[PDB]
UniProtKB/Swiss-Prot annotation, chain A:
Part of the full-length chain shown: 3243 to 3540 of 4382
Name of the featured protein: 3C-like proteinase nsp5
Catalytic reaction equation(s): TSAVLQ-|-SGFRK-NH2 and SGVTFQ-|-GKFKK the two peptides corresponding to the two self-cleavage sites of the SARS 3C-like proteinase are the two most reactive peptide substrates. The enzyme exhibits a strong preference for substrates containing Gln at P1 position and Leu at P2 position
Subcellular location(s) per record: Host cytoplasm; Host Golgi apparatus
Active site: H39 (for 3cl-pro activity), C143 (for 3cl-pro activity)
Length: 294, 300
């Protein structure tokens, strides 16, 4: 079982650069719209606490330089949607895949296509942490890079990059421009809440261990979901929802281990303290990631 | 931040095709008017046990091969064997062929793998060519013909084509000239690799990535000569560090302010004492699959 990115080609064909003045970031070109972080309109004086509405008043369609490589795509309209700009261009991207905009939940994994000046440089797998940050790898010029999943040739875009917190973790928005977490797009040091371990993914990792024959940790006990949640919160683990148990359906059926019986094994591991070669429980592989690469 | 990062795979996705001979199907790479694929596509399940490839190939003609790019059949107009690969000449040229090179990568170097099934890309991840000439990848049934590559300024350097999984779970394959990395052969037999060693240059590059990312606990005032470091490294099954390798670490040494030999002294203590329950970049072991190039690309 390994950490892998989705093939990025469908997303590479949508990356452009958006420039305002001397400030260039990345944009996502789908049909005749380019989506990009709104802070592209900021100068070093506006950045501390920008008044985006007032700043946008002094911007027209002719202020935006949108390029696919060095080829200019003319802007014929512009609007703001939460923390993004939606720039209407005069050319419909012929490389637009079948796509959706999705707002992911904590625990969920996605691929990130890191881009600089509209040019993709790398692709890696990320998980949305319970504190609404991602442990990414981004440098200056990376804003506007997107996160996505691909299911049956449909690209579900879930993330657009905007910020690096003082701790080194990253923060961004969904493709409607709404931040994940309590963060804001301004040049300030913003702290993320205390992070927790992703319970759903640790359980998946345990099932993946059982599928490969590593099952020493299983026991002859069971627990209620409520009693597991009460113990989990004392160990910094996320509580489990009715949905979490339902998504674990496939793995539970495959190994013959009931979800609640697995929680009892995880509950004993938390109270008492290798599995798949590691001393620590992996929490960035979802039940879907285990089922998919089985 | 610091993670395993693959090259964007789009330039390679546009080259992936499916190759079928009877009921045997695997992936091929379509560049200009040629499709490259593992030669074991000509085998039935029984032939794979002990193949005489020249005999199996003379029994096939151009019509024996069915090449599909998505849902469109590409007509085979020529065929030849180049080591463990087949070169199928097709009647059309791939317009999506990027600028490319074929390279035989050296141990310790990394590359991206685009895992494909039935001619369709499924996932992309980074691998390192181990000193024992295997790769620790992730491949399932139907993945043969999947390729490894690097990208440098729009140019794709293809270095690997997938053929086998050893009983230990590691993988074996060839370069794009069809020559296997290591002492492996393309038959249905259980095969062992030589004893592996740790890629010292990569561990040192990764310790520099840890210091760049704020993990410094392993640094100390201990010092070492290049020879005294290599004596310890060899004792622990690590590759010797040459002066050429010390020179490669120059830019990472300048960025962190930690002398190369001082980072060697830190590694020597980590080998001799262990990590004592502590972690480095969220790992309990010393990572050797990041090259100095991989570190600088992500950390500067
Ligand atoms: C993307 C901006 C970009 O590409 O602009 C093109 C000119 C960066 C992404 C960062 C850069 C380093 N790694 C990343 O992930 N975003 C920013 O620089 C933010 C811009 C905001 C939205 C206007 N700012 C920050 O991430 C930011 C600012 C500050 C602080 O200030 C003071 C203090 C601490 C941390 C911090 N982070
Ligand atoms: C790719 C072949 C393919 O796609 O063919 C389509 C019909 C597989 C890749 C393997 C499958 C599981 N993970 C992988 O990486 N290659 C093979 O199966 C090899 C075929 C050879 C080259 C003709 N064979 C092996 O890898 C192989 C055979 C055996 C053994 O036998 C007996 C015993 C132990 C291990 C082993 N590995």
């Amino acid at each position: 079982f390994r950490k892998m990115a989705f093939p990025s080609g469908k997303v590479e064909g949508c990356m452009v650069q958006v420039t305002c003045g001397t400030t260039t970031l990345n944009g996502l070109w789908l049909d005749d719209t380019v989506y990009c972080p709104r802070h592209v309109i900021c100068t070093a004086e506006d950045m501390l606490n920008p008044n985006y509405e007032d700043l946008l008043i002094r911007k027209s369609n002719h202020s935006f330089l949108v390029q696919a490589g060095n080829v200019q795509l003319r802007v014929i309209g512009h609007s703001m949607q939460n923390c993004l700009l939606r720039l209407k261009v005069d050319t419909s991207n012929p490389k637009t895949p079948k796509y959706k905009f999705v707002r992911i939940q904590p625990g969920q994994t996605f691929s990130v296509l890191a881009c600089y000046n509209g040019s993709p440089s790398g692709v890696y797998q990320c998980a949305m942490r319970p504190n609404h940050t991602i442990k990414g790898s981004f440098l200056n010029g990376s804003c506007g890079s997107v996160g996505f999943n691909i299911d049956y040739d449909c690209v579900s875009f879930c993330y657009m990059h905007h910020m690096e917190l003082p701790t080194g973790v990253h923060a961004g928005t969904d493709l409607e421009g709404k931040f994940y977490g309590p963060f804001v797009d301004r040049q300030t040091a913003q702290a993320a809440g205390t992070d927790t371990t992703i319970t759903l993914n640790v359980l998946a990792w345990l099932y993946a261990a059982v599928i490969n024959g590593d099952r020493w940790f299983l026991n002859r006990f069971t627990t209620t979901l409520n009693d597991f949640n009460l113990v989990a919160m004392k160990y910094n683990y996320e509580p489990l929802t009715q949905d979490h148990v339902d998504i674990l359906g496939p793995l539970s059926a495959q190994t013959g281990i009931a979800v609640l019986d697995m929680c009892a094994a995880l509950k004993e591991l938390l109270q008492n303290g290798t599995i798949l070669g590691s001393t620590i429980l992996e929490d960035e592989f979802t039940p879907f990631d285990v089922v998919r690469q089985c």
